[PDB]
Design an enzyme around this catalytic site. Structure first.
Site, PDB file in Angstrom:
ATOM      1  N   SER A   1      17.168 -15.984 -33.484  1.00 13.39           N
ATOM      2  CA  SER A   1      18.486 -15.361 -33.358  1.00 13.39           C
ATOM      3  C   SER A   1      18.421 -14.038 -32.619  1.00 13.39           C
ATOM      4  CB  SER A   1      19.152 -15.103 -34.722  1.00 13.39           C
ATOM      5  OG  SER A   1      20.498 -14.692 -34.433  1.00 13.39           O
TER       6      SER A   1
ATOM      7  N   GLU B   1      -1.285   9.530  -4.751  1.00 14.95           N
ATOM      8  CA  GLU B   1      -0.294   8.589  -5.225  1.00 14.95           C
ATOM      9  C   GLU B   1      -0.702   7.246  -4.657  1.00 14.95           C
ATOM     10  OE1 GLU B   1       1.796   6.546  -3.310  1.00 14.95           O
ATOM     11  OE2 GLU B   1       3.228   5.897  -4.834  1.00 14.95           O
TER      12      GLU B   1
ATOM     13  N   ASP C   1      19.628  18.702 -27.043  1.00 11.84           N
ATOM     14  CA  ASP C   1      18.387  18.082 -27.499  1.00 11.84           C
ATOM     15  C   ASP C   1      18.644  16.599 -27.769  1.00 11.84           C
ATOM     16  OD1 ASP C   1      16.940  20.390 -27.236  1.00 11.84           O
ATOM     17  OD2 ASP C   1      16.617  20.719 -29.379  1.00 11.84           O
TER      18      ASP C   1
ATOM     19  N   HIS D   1       8.168   2.181 -22.848  1.00  7.85           N
ATOM     20  CA  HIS D   1       9.645   2.207 -22.897  1.00  7.85           C
ATOM     21  C   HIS D   1      10.039   0.736 -23.253  1.00  7.85           C
ATOM     22  CE1 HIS D   1      13.863   2.927 -21.720  1.00  7.85           C
ATOM     23  NE2 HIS D   1      13.547   4.165 -21.362  1.00  7.85           N
TER      24      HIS D   1
HETATM   25  O1  LIG Z   1      -0.158   2.173  -6.923  1.00 16.18           O
HETATM   26  C1  LIG Z   1       1.068   2.079  -7.028  1.00 16.18           C
HETATM   27  O2  LIG Z   1       1.647   1.812  -8.102  1.00 16.18           O
HETATM   28  C2  LIG Z   1       1.959   2.298  -5.748  1.00 16.18           C
HETATM   29  C3  LIG Z   1       1.177   3.006  -4.579  1.00 16.18           C
HETATM   30  C4  LIG Z   1       2.022   2.925  -3.259  1.00 16.18           C
HETATM   31  N1  LIG Z   1       3.372   3.489  -3.481  1.00 16.18           N
HETATM   32  P1  LIG Z   1       4.284   3.898  -2.125  1.00 16.18           P
HETATM   33  O3  LIG Z   1       3.651   3.071  -0.903  1.00 16.18           O
HETATM   34  O4  LIG Z   1       4.301   5.354  -1.914  1.00 16.18           O
HETATM   35  O5  LIG Z   1       5.739   3.480  -2.376  1.00 16.18           O
HETATM   36  C5  LIG Z   1       6.058   2.085  -2.535  1.00 16.18           C
HETATM   37  C6  LIG Z   1       7.359   1.893  -3.255  1.00 16.18           C
HETATM   38  C7  LIG Z   1       7.892   0.484  -2.878  1.00 16.18           C
HETATM   39  C8  LIG Z   1       9.075   0.293  -3.770  1.00 16.18           C
HETATM   40  N2  LIG Z   1       9.638  -1.011  -3.570  1.00 16.18           N
HETATM   41  C9  LIG Z   1      10.748  -1.329  -4.240  1.00 16.18           C
HETATM   42  O6  LIG Z   1      11.301  -0.608  -5.098  1.00 16.18           O
HETATM   43  C10 LIG Z   1      11.337  -2.665  -3.830  1.00 16.18           C
HETATM   44  C11 LIG Z   1      11.613  -3.498  -5.071  1.00 16.18           C
HETATM   45  C12 LIG Z   1      12.755  -4.510  -4.810  1.00 16.18           C
HETATM   46  N3  LIG Z   1      14.028  -3.805  -4.485  1.00 16.18           N
HETATM   47  C13 LIG Z   1      14.407  -3.546  -3.213  1.00 16.18           C
HETATM   48  O7  LIG Z   1      13.736  -3.952  -2.262  1.00 16.18           O
HETATM   49  C14 LIG Z   1      15.655  -2.881  -3.012  1.00 16.18           C
HETATM   50  C15 LIG Z   1      16.124  -2.701  -1.692  1.00 16.18           C
HETATM   51  C16 LIG Z   1      17.347  -2.072  -1.409  1.00 16.18           C
HETATM   52  C17 LIG Z   1      18.155  -1.606  -2.460  1.00 16.18           C
HETATM   53  F1  LIG Z   1      19.558  -0.893  -2.119  1.00 16.18           F
HETATM   54  C18 LIG Z   1      17.711  -1.774  -3.792  1.00 16.18           C
HETATM   55  C19 LIG Z   1      16.476  -2.402  -4.065  1.00 16.18           C
HETATM   56  C20 LIG Z   1      12.888  -5.384  -6.086  1.00 16.18           C
HETATM   57  O8  LIG Z   1      13.546  -4.902  -7.057  1.00 16.18           O
HETATM   58  O9  LIG Z   1      12.297  -6.503  -6.061  1.00 16.18           O
HETATM   59  C21 LIG Z   1      10.190   1.308  -3.332  1.00 16.18           C
HETATM   60  O10 LIG Z   1      10.783   1.097  -2.247  1.00 16.18           O
HETATM   61  O11 LIG Z   1      10.462   2.230  -4.129  1.00 16.18           O
HETATM   62  C22 LIG Z   1       2.104   1.448  -2.814  1.00 16.18           C
HETATM   63  O12 LIG Z   1       3.151   0.789  -3.107  1.00 16.18           O
HETATM   64  O13 LIG Z   1       1.081   0.998  -2.215  1.00 16.18           O
HETATM   65 ZN   LIG Z   2       4.831   6.960  -1.004  1.00 16.71          ZN
HETATM   66 ZN   LIG Z   3       2.805   4.266   0.425  1.00 16.09          ZN
END
Ligand SMILES: O=C(O)CC[C@H](NP(=O)(O)OCCC[C@H](NC(=O)CC[C@H](NC(=O)c1ccc(F)cc1)C(=O)O)C(=O)O)C(=O)O
Ligand SMILES: [Zn+2]
Ligand SMILES: [Zn+2]
Ligand SMILES: *[C@@H]1O[C@H](CO)[C@@H](O[C@@H]2O[C@H](CO)[C@@H](O[C@@H]3O[C@H](CO[C@H]4O[C@H](CO)[C@@H](O)[C@H](O)[C@@H]4O)[C@@H](O)[C@H](O[C@H]4O[C@H](CO)[C@@H](O)[C@H](O)[C@@H]4O)[C@@H]3O)[C@H](O)[C@H]2NC(C)=O)[C@H](O)[C@H]1NC(C)=O
Ligand SMILES: *[C@@H]1O[C@H](CO)[C@@H](O[C@@H]2O[C@H](CO)[C@@H](O[C@@H]3O[C@H](CO[C@H]4O[C@H](CO)[C@@H](O)[C@H](O)[C@@H]4O)[C@@H](O)[C@H](O[C@H]4O[C@H](CO)[C@@H](O)[C@H](O)[C@@H]4O)[C@@H]3O)[C@H](O)[C@H]2NC(C)=O)[C@H](O)[C@H]1NC(C)=O
Ligand SMILES: O=C(O)CC[C@H](NP(=O)(O)OCCC[C@H](NC(=O)CC[C@H](NC(=O)c1ccc(F)cc1)C(=O)O)C(=O)O)C(=O)O
Ligand SMILES: *[C@@H]1O[C@H](CO)[C@@H](O[C@@H]2O[C@H](CO)[C@@H](O[C@@H]3O[C@H](CO)[C@@H](O)[C@H](O)[C@@H]3O)[C@H](O)[C@H]2NC(C)=O)[C@H](O)[C@H]1NC(C)=O
Ligand SMILES: *[C@@H]1O[C@H](CO)[C@@H](O[C@@H]2O[C@H](CO)[C@@H](O[C@@H]3O[C@H](CO)[C@@H](O)[C@H](O)[C@@H]3O)[C@H](O)[C@H]2NC(C)=O)[C@H](O)[C@H]1NC(C)=O
Ligand SMILES: *[C@@H]1O[C@H](CO[C@@H]2O[C@@H](C)[C@@H](O)[C@@H](O)[C@@H]2O)[C@@H](O[C@@H]2O[C@H](CO)[C@@H](O)[C@H](O)[C@H]2NC(C)=O)[C@H](O)[C@H]1NC(C)=O
Ligand SMILES: *[C@@H]1O[C@H](CO[C@@H]2O[C@@H](C)[C@@H](O)[C@@H](O)[C@@H]2O)[C@@H](O[C@@H]2O[C@H](CO)[C@@H](O)[C@H](O)[C@H]2NC(C)=O)[C@H](O)[C@H]1NC(C)=O
Ligand SMILES: *[C@@H]1O[C@H](CO[C@@H]2O[C@@H](C)[C@@H](O)[C@@H](O)[C@@H]2O)[C@@H](O[C@@H]2O[C@H](CO)[C@@H](O)[C@H](O)[C@H]2NC(C)=O)[C@H](O)[C@H]1NC(C)=O
Ligand SMILES: *[C@@H]1O[C@H](CO[C@@H]2O[C@@H](C)[C@@H](O)[C@@H](O)[C@@H]2O)[C@@H](O[C@@H]2O[C@H](CO)[C@@H](O)[C@H](O)[C@H]2NC(C)=O)[C@H](O)[C@H]1NC(C)=O
Ligand SMILES: *[C@@H]1O[C@H](CO)[C@@H](O[C@@H]2O[C@H](CO)[C@@H](O)[C@H](O)[C@H]2NC(C)=O)[C@H](O)[C@H]1NC(C)=O
Ligand SMILES: *[C@@H]1O[C@H](CO)[C@@H](O[C@@H]2O[C@H](CO)[C@@H](O)[C@H](O)[C@H]2NC(C)=O)[C@H](O)[C@H]1NC(C)=O
Ligand SMILES: *[C@@H]1O[C@H](CO)[C@@H](O)[C@H](O)[C@H]1NC(C)=O
Ligand SMILES: *[C@@H]1O[C@H](CO)[C@@H](O)[C@H](O)[C@H]1NC(C)=O
Ligand SMILES: *[C@@H]1O[C@H](CO)[C@@H](O)[C@H](O)[C@H]1NC(C)=O
Ligand SMILES: *[C@@H]1O[C@H](CO)[C@@H](O)[C@H](O)[C@H]1NC(C)=O
Ligand SMILES: [Ca+2]
Ligand SMILES: [Ca+2]
Ligand SMILES: [Cl-]
Ligand SMILES: [Cl-]
Ligand SMILES: [Zn+2]
Ligand SMILES: [Zn+2]
Lengths: 692, 692
Positions: free
Chosen positions: A572, A370, A608, A631
């Site tokens: 529009s 991932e 469905d 989407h």
């Molecule tokens: O290659 C890829 O696509 C990802 C690989 C890897 N994924 P990995 O390291 O396993 O996971 C990273 C996920 C970060 C993500 N941030 C966010 O969703 C933050 C986005 C942010 N929102 C927020 O920060 C947020 C905080 C609190 C809350 F109640 C609601 C929202 C925003 O909308 O601007 C989260 O917290 O879900 C990486 O990011 O390095």
């Molecule tokens: Zn992760």
């Molecule tokens: Zn990570």
């Protein structure tokens, strides 16, 4: 009884604790032997736990690693070419781990090799608006410069793409204490803050949902045809390397040129945060040199896929998936999620051993790679896209269970809102001061909805995690939940992707009683239970109608900043509001029928229609230049893969439209996206009409 | 009893005769008031007949018409610019129709306007191999010449595309007696042959499944965004006009230059069939001038959609569709098909009035603007693609019921082979000499399978008709049947798309007793009946396994003409044969389970696996540069839209590969298509595995 309560009561905090300890003793980097061995362990235990089948699904995908005998580093060089300062070759390991082998040193995965030498420009967070400010307002040219950017605000891949489009010849990423050091807390091991020597690993790809860079569209199986590297998807074209704030301070302190434009550009270090280019007078002949020697290599990865066959609708799949690969120990990311999945499997298996089965098939996944671009989940979904398309009810993600200890955070499709509200009203709050209260009550108090009294905030799905292929490519209803921090007294969590993110970090500072982990297991596990066992699928189409109107208002308000152009080009939004109005009417009627029908064909016909409703938002032609984001209501923001954007086709057509040199063409394209969106909303609505 | 026999017995030859007469008294050209009035009549009658709902679905699509006050024609001009010969402005109308208004004069629909003047080159049928012969072998350059081509062998749009790629500045299409005049038969009105003044109308687009040229992907509804004409799909870039053989003879007789290369280039006129360029010595200063003034115009079209709701699975659709628009009277094309549809609706409605309903929903369609590029069916399928994707069981086409009176012709997916064999064994042969014998027996005797003793020939679906969107774009099992000629004693039928194609043509020469029409109504209606009413869907997956192996053998044999390149580039078909072997094994096991399961969920699960099997051959990325041809096993031939090609991705990658200037790249692309095909065959197979 075998009901949700039995399932939930069987979950234990102590089990989750044991599993987290077990998963975090050594690194489990994608494509390494240790992570293959962990896959085989999980496969064996899931079988022991009672799943009907547990297999490994392997793929050979492009990964990236530093060269063990030619380390990556950054220098300040003088005029004679003497490297007078070098960045660190590794993070000082934490207490007790100083002899642990195979800790990958900090690097930016998928950086090309190079040794560019040049003058620095500081670009703040390297966001689209930061480069606008540099180029349009400050008249600073990044072309041929090495850019230094602080981590935070947006996905680091977007930063690199932005620096590349500005003409940078290299990027240095660093963790500023402003963004990674909470005031009044000690740095690791004495608190949960990032030390000056700590560094955030992470990939810097721009895949836009493609999966393995060499095989877009098709699983990277044993006979797969691979693109040549020059045609690969999403690789950066300039060298990139991350550093900590001790090293950043040494790079920033000498910076000259222009002052920062305002306080939003200043972090917390004792430096002026000058933008440059280059160093102040006495040091003006010194340069910065990067040395990057990492290599991209096609490497085998392994997903574990567990199946618990449904008793009544075995051809309907509810999927609980999260990753297993980590940058180093993965104390939070992902093993706090993977330990919760493991306990969830164990509990479902306990019930299976007593003769129970869910109504629908549950699939459990431990995804690999991932961290290198959602590769394991995306390849498997490419392999199985036909089964998933026609049979996938829902996907519940299960990465990091905790990023704080304040309250719940849920991001999901509107189709799950009512499921989540109902479930959390039936769960106990683990929060101090809320003993005897529901999770719904504590969550709603701590994180109120911005639009409705007495409801909690639920966010849109963005991306940066393994739901992306299921939701944005395939149109399967998706959700996630975790415990999070108070965003108003504090940028994720400080030790993210550092060697310091350990079991002890979680056990000592985040969740010593494992009660937040347990709550998260109840929410994820309970969602899966309801999705897999409810007679009628627990989706409320009416919640999509409400949000569609909110997003239509929002996109119309953006366009209405340009009234003269809307007049000139006859732009529009009538058709979109009409479609949203129809969706609201048809959904309301469908809800009445759903309440008002012993007939399993009508039920299944109606299930469905429920299941295919998320599917109806898929456009098989994709969004412009992003064919795997299909989407039409939701896509990852083109400026920040982590954030979701609504009506992304229209949003991107309107973005910075005043700077387009052919306004007729630009506004034509706005109108085209309005038509596509109106049509898709109406088409989705019509899937809920009486079928004949 | 309400069973198939009741349905079949209710069909009457005399009704079909009455309906054909009723539909062919005046022209019903797409987008004209007369064809809107016919739509409303059909809508009213289908309601009267007892359908549950009958609606018009309208779209505004690009059509093409001659200019009434500026006629299209072709001249031979002399050096002074005197037009010394002009082609006809209309076909002499047949007896009794000389006062009929609104007969569109012959033209090539969608020709651009122009008046190009130049030297003629004769290009035989204007097929890919004819232009190879001109350019590679004869060293004749078509660049800047007007090309004249005989109709026949391939779709006329492919001819125009081929002439355009050769650099022609105009195309003249003509009907050669070799291809449109059967020896020993009289021309109309005295026999069924084409008179010298007769001319074949027809569109010359290259849409590749797009539908309306201005709205690819989306229905051309009231708010649709339209491409500008310069970005439209599939329009020709040079003027094109069709003529009859009296006029062709005047154009060809003066031709000089090179002799025809061989007898396959000589038609039946008393001319040398010289290739040119230009005229023989005395006439060498004369030129040919075209005058084309037709206009493309967005025009409203109307489909009629009739619904007979299913009693048990109303969310499963069996569709019987055929077009209603004609070039002129449409005596054969399409009204001989539309009259059969009308009688089929009438019979189903008789049963509905007695309290019967089919198990599944039957949809009946009268498509508009088929003759202008399958526009009506394609727009409606674009509008309803989500419903069709998830609910479409099958599509049975219903164009021309007769093109001869010799035997049956069936083209369909392999999934229908067993349905068709079984049905035709239960129908009476209407053939002379086969009284008391089954249709299967007569058909098998007259048109034996090339591969199996005691079986009839069933062809692959090609295109050039309204099943294209359902089959090649959406992956819904599709079929068609009609009566045809003896292809071994004879190019369609001679009067195709001429004013002479009338009711009298059919009544006097093709089917005076309407017994062939009745047989065709029984075959189409019986297929629909079984598809809509059989408890288990009447598809045999094992028949797909057999043909996949045949097509794999075939494509491998093409590649094996290049053994050195297969060695050099390591081109293996192993993965495809492996996938086909697995498909055969899994299909066999699925068939056993299908035979071996009171459980309606298992049934419906199994019916869903049957229904989604054709769907599994769809690749959502489409074939190279043809995004609306998504089926990986079958696509219309890139050289002739009428003919189906199997494994088209691989076929096109191998086509003329020896002439590609980068063989490594070309063979790389062959290997890529092998991988895509192997993967898709395996993925389809896996949809038939146990679901969990
Ligand atoms: O290659 C890829 O696509 C990802 C690989 C890897 N994924 P990995 O390291 O396993 O996971 C990273 C996920 C970060 C993500 N941030 C966010 O969703 C933050 C986005 C942010 N929102 C927020 O920060 C947020 C905080 C609190 C809350 F109640 C609601 C929202 C925003 O909308 O601007 C989260 O917290 O879900 C990486 O990011 O390095
Ligand atoms: Zn992760
Ligand atoms: Zn990570
Ligand atoms: C939200 O849902 C509503 C339904 O409640 C949809 O309403 C449709 O809106 C369309 C487009 O505005 C209407 O289209 C018009 O149809 C007229 C003919 O309709 C009759 O015939 C059809 C089929 O026979 C029936 O379905 C219908 O009941 C009627 O009997 C046309 O004549 C109109 O075109 C004329 O006027 C327009 C506009 O001025 C001109 O541009 C044309 O050149 C022409 O003169 C027009 O095409 C349709 O009738 C509506 N259906 C209804 C009310 O049932 C909305 O479309 C939907 N929203 C979205 C985004 O899909
Ligand atoms: C037609 O159907 C058959 C099944 O009957 C499929 O057979 C599969 O073929 C693939 C590719 O050839 C085999 O892939 C190999 O898998 C080995 C591991 O398999 C084990 O583990 C998996 C999951 O844990 C299980 O499913 C399986 O039962 C085994 O327990 C790998 O080790 C192989 O890679 C090694 O050898 C290759 C080839 O020399 C090297 O290139 C590698 O570098 C490595 O050294 C290999 O990937 C797979 O096992 C087969 N499954 C079976 C027999 O069940 C066909 O693929 C299918 N046809 C098509 C077109 O899909
Ligand atoms: O825009 C479009 O796509 C089509 C508009 C319009 N369609 P419209 O005018 O309404 O219908 C034309 C359909 C011709 C087609 N020919 C074919 O399928 C002939 C193809 C040919 N096969 C055969 O000729 C054939 C003959 C006898 C038999 F027992 C089996 C096959 C081949 O494979 O090379 C058929 O007979 O089904 C048009 O063609 O002008
Ligand atoms: C979340 O919980 C709410 C509250 O329980 C669920 O809504 C409730 O759903 C039930 C079951 O369908 C509804 O009961 C019905 O009431 C009507 C008469 O009002 C009657 O026609 C039916 O026979 C049945 O008794 C109930 O009204 C409804 N309550 C509401 C909307 O306030 C909701 O379904 C749950 N959401 C899920 C499961 O996604
Ligand atoms: C076309 O007609 C043929 C011949 O009738 C159909 O094949 C037959 O299908 C029936 C019904 O499933 C089979 O009967 C079964 O026989 C086995 C024992 O041999 C038993 O397990 C079942 O309980 C049942 O009695 C029959 O064997 C089979 N005959 C064959 C293959 O020769 C075929 O299904 C029809 N095709 C369609 C409807 O698409
Ligand atoms: C990874 O790097 C090694 C070692 O790099 C060497 O040491 C560095 C500090 C620097 O001085 C480099 O220029 C050195 O080459 C690579 O191994 C070398 O490869 C070359 C052939 O290209 C060979 O002639 C050298 O002797 C090798 N040196 C050693 C010490 O083994 C190796 O190529 C790199 N691995 C990759 C790219 O995957
Ligand atoms: C900064 O580092 C350079 C290079 O050091 C080499 O690579 C490092 C990653 C590390 O592995 C070192 O042990 C390697 O020697 C230093 O410059 C080198 O110095 C050596 C010995 O003095 C000399 O022979 C080399 O030619 C130099 N290499 C280069 C590229 O200049 C430099 O001294 C270090 N600077 C500081 C302040 O420590
Ligand atoms: C269709 O053609 C008419 C008529 O064309 C005229 O007569 C022809 C034989 C030839 O001599 C043409 O050049 C003539 O113009 C078009 O009507 C004419 O349009 C122009 C404006 O463009 C006008 O000034 C003329 O007076 C019109 N002539 C007549 C007789 O009405 C008309 O434009 C064409 N229709 C289309 C393109 O849809
Ligand atoms: C061939 O036709 C041209 C043009 O005739 C005009 O357009 C035709 C479609 C038809 O509608 C005719 O009635 C029209 O007059 C003839 O050349 C024209 O002749 C007239 C009168 O003699 C003259 O004034 C025009 O300028 C001519 N037009 C052109 C374009 O040259 C020609 O005579 C016809 N040739 C033969 C052999 O019949
Ligand atoms: C994580 O837990 C697993 C499962 O208990 C441990 O693996 C077992 O180790 C014992 C002793 O070595 C073996 O006898 C078993 O065969 C293993 N079971 C498996 C692999 O399913 C593993 O040692 C633990 N890891 C750590 C680091 O504590
Ligand atoms: C084709 O048949 C239809 C249906 O019988 C005829 O239309 C009917 O004509 C009568 C007499 O004009 C009217 O009273 C009915 O209202 C019509 N019914 C409809 C339109 O449903 C039509 O005249 C016939 N056409 C020809 C050319 O014979
Ligand atoms: C930035 O710098 C380079 C010159 O080194 C130049 O080619 C490029 O076009 C410049 N861009 C702007 C906007 O000044
Ligand atoms: C845990 O919660 C306490 C109490 O609010 C807080 O002071 C502390 O900062 C939290 N720990 C983490 C890692 O967020
Ligand atoms: C054909 O003719 C034109 C010259 O009129 C030329 O430009 C074109 O390239 C020629 N092609 C060949 C293959 O001779
Ligand atoms: C009808 O069948 C007869 C008998 O074989 C044949 O001679 C005649 O050519 C056929 N008519 C047509 C239009 O094919
Ligand atoms: Ca892939
Ligand atoms: Ca369209
Ligand atoms: Cl998550
Ligand atoms: Cl047909
Ligand atoms: Zn036709
Ligand atoms: Zn036709």
């Amino acid at each position: 009884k075998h009901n949700m309560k039995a399932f939930l009561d069987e979950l234990k905090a102590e089990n989750i604790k044991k599993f987290l300890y077990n998963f975090t003793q050594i690194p489990h980097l994608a494509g390494t032997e240790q992570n293959f061995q962990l896959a085989k362990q999980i496969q064996s235990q899931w079988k022991e736990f009672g799943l009907d089948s547990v297999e490994l699904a392997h793929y050979d995908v492009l990964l990236s690693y530093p060269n063990k005998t030619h380390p990556n580093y950054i220098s300040i060089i003088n005029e004679d070419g003497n490297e007078i300062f070098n960045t660190s070759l590794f993070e000082p390991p934490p207490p007790g781990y100083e002899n642990v082998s195979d800790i990958v040193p900090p690097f930016s995965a998928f950086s090309p090799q190079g040794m560019p030498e040049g003058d620095l420009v500081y670009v703040n967070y390297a966001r689209t608006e930061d480069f606008f400010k540099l180029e349009r307002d400050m008249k600073i040219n990044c072309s041929g410069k090495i850019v230094i950017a602080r981590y935070g605000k947006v996905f680091r891949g977007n930063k690199v793409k932005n620096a590349q489009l500005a003409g940078a010849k290299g990027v240095i990423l660093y963790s500023d204490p402003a963004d990674y050091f909470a005031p009044g807390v000690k740095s690791y091991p004495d608190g949960w803050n990032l030390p000056g020597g700590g560094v955030q690993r992470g990939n810097i790809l721009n895949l836009n949902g493609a999966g393995d860079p060499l095989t877009p569209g098709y699983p990277a199986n044993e006979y797969a045809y691979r693109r040549g590297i020059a045609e690969a998807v999403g690789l950066p074209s300039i060298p990139v390397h991350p550093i900590g704030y001790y090293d950043a301070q040494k790079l920033l302190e000498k910076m000259g040129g222009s002052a920062p434009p305002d306080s939003s550009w200043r972090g917390s270090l004792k430096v002026p945060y000058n933008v440059g280019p280059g160093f102040t007078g006495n040091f003006s002949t010194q340069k910065v040199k990067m040395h990057i020697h990492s290599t991209n290599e096609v490497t085998r990865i392994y997903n574990v896929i567990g199946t618990l066959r449904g008793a009544v609708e075995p051809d309907r799949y509810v999927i609980l998936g999260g990753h297993r690969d980590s940058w180093v120990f993965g104390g939070i990311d992902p093993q706090s999620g993977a330990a919760v999945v493991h306990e969830i499997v164990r509990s479902f298996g306990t019930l299976k051993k007593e003769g129970w089965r869910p109504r629908r098939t549950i699939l459990f996944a431990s995804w690999d790679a991932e961290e290198f671009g959602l590769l394991g989940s995306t390849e498997w979904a490419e392999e199985n896209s036909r089964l998933l398309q026609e049979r996938g009810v829902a996907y519940i993600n299960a990465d990091s269970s905790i990023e704080g200890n304040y309250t719940l955070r849920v991001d999901c499709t509107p189709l799950m809102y009512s499921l989540v509200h109902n479930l959390t009203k039936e769960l106990k709050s683990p929060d101090e001061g809320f003993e005897g209260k529901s999770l719904y009550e504590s969550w709603t108090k701590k994180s109120p909805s911005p639009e409705f009294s007495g409801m909690p905030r639920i966010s849109k799905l963005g991306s940066g995690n393994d739901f992306e292929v299921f939701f944005q490519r395939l149109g399967i209803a998706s959700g996630r939940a975790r415990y999070t921090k108070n965003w108003e007294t504090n940028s994720g969590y400080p030790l993210y992707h550092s060697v310091y993110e350990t079991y002890e970090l979680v056990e000592k500072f985040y969740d010593p009683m494992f009660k937040y982990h347990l709550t998260v297991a109840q929410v994820r596990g309970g969602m899966v239970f309801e999705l897999a066992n409810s007679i009628v699928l627990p989706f409320d189409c009416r919640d999509y109608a409400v949000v569609l109107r909110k997003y239509a208002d929002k996109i119309y308000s953006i366009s209405m900043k340009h009234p003269q152009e809307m007049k000139t080009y006859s732009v529009s939004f009538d058709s979109l509001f009409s479609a949203v109005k129809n969706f609201t009417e048809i959904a309301s009627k469908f809800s009445e029928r759903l309440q008002d029908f012993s007939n399993p064909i009508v039920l299944r016909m109606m299930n469905d229609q429920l299941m295919f409703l998320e599917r109806a938002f898929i456009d098989p032609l994709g969004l412009p230049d992003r064919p795997f984001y299909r989407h039409v209501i939701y896509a990852p923001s083109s400026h920040n893969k982590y954030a979701g954007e609504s009506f992304p086709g229209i949003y991107d057509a309107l973005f910075d439209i005043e700077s387009k040199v052919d306004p007729s063409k630009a506004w034509g394209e706005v109108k085209r996206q309005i038509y596509v969106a109106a049509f898709t909303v109406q088409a989705a609505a019509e899937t809920l009409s009486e079928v004949a």
